[PDB]
Amino acid sequence: SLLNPSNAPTRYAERSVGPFSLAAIWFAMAIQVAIFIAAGQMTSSFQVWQVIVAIAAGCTIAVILLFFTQSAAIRWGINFTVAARMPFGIRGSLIPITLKALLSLFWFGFQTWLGALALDEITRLLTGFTNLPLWIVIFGAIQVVTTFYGITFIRWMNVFASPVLLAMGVYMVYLMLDGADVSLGEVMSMGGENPGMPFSTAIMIFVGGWIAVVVSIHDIVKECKVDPNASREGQTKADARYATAQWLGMVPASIIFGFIGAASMVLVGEWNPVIAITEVVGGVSIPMAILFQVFVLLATWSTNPAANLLSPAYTLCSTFPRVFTFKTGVIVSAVVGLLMMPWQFAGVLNTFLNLLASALGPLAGIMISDYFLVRRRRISLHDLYRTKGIYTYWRGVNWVALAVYAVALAVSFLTPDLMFVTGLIAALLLHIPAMRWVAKTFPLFSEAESRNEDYL
Ligand SMILES: O=C1NC(=O)[C@H](Cc2c[nH]c3ccccc23)N1
Ligand code: NA
């Protein structure tokens, strides 16, 4: 048996996130340094308005993906890590999940770094003392302790950060434009003086940004509010209402701040607004500096925990259920995370983001397909928490599913600028015959699936 209180499905009465709250989480979750860089570097290949469009487009495909990847977690309250057990093995799932927990972990140490940079700047702008690693640890630690409070903290922290972050951001655009004596419309076409990159791969970069979160949203949305006595059409509007809430959360947030990163690049040659505003205005007071850094910190805190630390936590406490608990998995994830020292990753994000999409495109495709197409939303919680059942396949691993992943990954390389969308579509479609084959050896349903409601 693999069940423990932390890795257990989330009971209807325990659920706490409705549609407004999820929008309020996503809005603050999208406001984070990294998109300055991405949208900034994009000004190299396109002008600002197109970048904004590549952002809105990439945001929209992500949401279309969310509508599907979130449906089982909302309805059944389950983990990502737990949910992967279905198509891949009970243990075989650990392979893609380890890939993904690693990715997830990589982002955590990265943003902790950016956060640390911020706190260290506030202090050295007061005390001149400029030790970074200590502020690294201290921040990693603080996140761990606020993450102990799971989604309860996340949800309260993001509702108050959101408008503040929204305001700090709208202010930023006024200060730049003003101090440079430029209208909004003028800046809207200042970029793109070195074309070469296709616009599709631009969209693919901003999708590649959130692919990890989208593919494992479970860990957030297993906390969402559901009415168990809906219907097919009421369950679908529920899905659509949530997906819509995520759209209104990540789009308007990441457009304003994507634009800020782009504007910085194009006005002054740097994606970082500290520099761009400092120059254009010719220095700023120590308060107003400290301020900016308070922003960065507030913008990191609203993204890192929820987006980067939750899912490996749940991976530990759900694979080693008597060894780890949520809180302990949080401690082990933030330590490994920082010990990956990701701040030394050479290159630029864009290509990394191009890496992230074509690497998880089939994973999202296989999960959407197994649950929606193969099984028809008809799942067995019982067997998900037991070493030997209908999801055990060949001694814990479903090799045919690991094959479909490879194959789809291959075909993906035949269309480099759309890698992700072919690999998703390929994995999606192949899972069907592959699964109609595996179904001749192993059963797709179980009697114990009638105990589903016992869990809830
Ligand atoms: O899956 C992810 N977890 C993270 O922290 C990053 C977030 C992230 C990094 N770069 C971006 C550019 C645009 C939008 C989001 C991002 N991606
Ligand atoms: Na944030």
How far is ligand 1, taken at its centre, from the CA of residue 76, in Å?
A: 27
Whether 213 is in the pocket of ligand 1, judged by its Cβ within 6 Å, is: yes
383 to 19, 252, 443: CA distances (angstroms): 30, 41, 12
DSSP state of 448: G
Q: For residues 144 and 71, what is the distance between their CA atoms, to the nearest angstrom?
A: 28
Q: Is 371 near ligand 1, meaning CB less than 6 Å away?
A: no
Q: Are 221 and 67 in contact (CB under 8 A)?
A: no
**Whether residue 51 has its Cβ less than 6 Å from ligand 1:** no
- Nearest atom in ligand 1 to the alpha carbon of residue 38 is 12
Distance from residue 92's CA to the centre of ligand 1 (Å): 27
- 428 Cα: distance to centroid of ligand 2 (angstroms): 32
Check: CB of residue 56 under 8 Å from CB of residue 256.
no
Question: Following DSSP, what letter does each residue of 139-170 receive, concatenated?
Answer: HHHHHHHHHTTHHHHHHHHHHHHHHHHHHHHH
Report d(CA 320, CA 127) in Å as an integer: 45
Q: How far, in Å, is the centroid of ligand 1 from the Cα of 399? A: 31
Domain covering 1-456: architecture: Orthogonal Bundle (1.10)
- What residue owns the CA closest to ligand 1's atom 4? 107
User: Residue 339, class by beta-carbon neighbours within 10 Å (0-12 exposed, 13-18 middle, 19+ buried)?
Assistant: exposed
167 among annotated binding-site residues: no
Q: Is the CB of 34 under 6 A from ligand 1?
A: yes
Query: What technique determined this structure?
Result: X-ray
Phi, psi at 217, each rounded to 5°: -55, -30
Specify the ligand 1 atom closest to the Cα of 111. Answer: 5
Establish whether 302 is an annotated binding residue: yes
Angstrom distance (rounded) from CA 66 to CA 60: 10
Distance 202 CA to ligand 2 centre (A): 22
Tokens describing residue 172: 């930023």
Map tokens 């929209």 to a residue: 60
Domain positions in the chain = 1-456
How far is residue 299's CA from residue 115's CA, in Å, rounded to a whole number?
A: 9
38 lines ligand 1 (CB under 6 A): yes
Assess whether the C-beta atom of 318 lies below 6 angstroms from ligand 1. Answer: no
Helix (H) or strand (E) holding 242: helix 232-268
Q: Which residue has the tokens 């949305």?
A: 221
* Chain-centre distance for alpha carbon 391: 27
Taking the C-alpha atoms of residue 366 and residue 425, their distance in angstroms, rounded to an integer, is: 9
Paired residues of 397 in beta bridges? 394
Q: CA separation (Å) from 44 to 96, 375, 416?
A: 34, 46, 20
Residue 377 Rama label (left phi>0; alpha psi -120 to 50; beta): left
Looking from the CA of residue 210, the nearest atom of ligand 1 is 1
Task: Please check if 293 is assigned to a binding site.
Answer: no
13, 173 Cβ separation under 8 angstroms: no
Joined together, the tokens standing for residue 245 give 């809430």
Q: Which of 71, 415, 400 is nearest to 232 (CA)?
A: 71
Cα(329)–Cα(316) distance, integer angstroms: 6
Q: How far apart, in whole angstroms, are the C-alpha atoms of residue 17 and residue 226? A: 9
For the record, the structure tokens of 291 come out as: 């301020």
Rounded to whole angstroms, the Cα distance separating 106 from 272 reads: 21
Residues 6 or more apart whose CB falls under 8 angstroms from that of 235 comprise 71, 75
97 annotated ligand binder: no
The amino acid occupying position 225 is K
Classified as helix, coil or strand, 270 is coil
CB of 206 closer than 6 angstroms to any ligand 1 atom? yes
CB of residue 55 inside a 6 A radius of ligand 1:
no
Residue nearest to atom 8 of ligand 1 (CA): 209
User: How far is 193 from 292, CA to CA, in rounded Å?
Assistant: 30
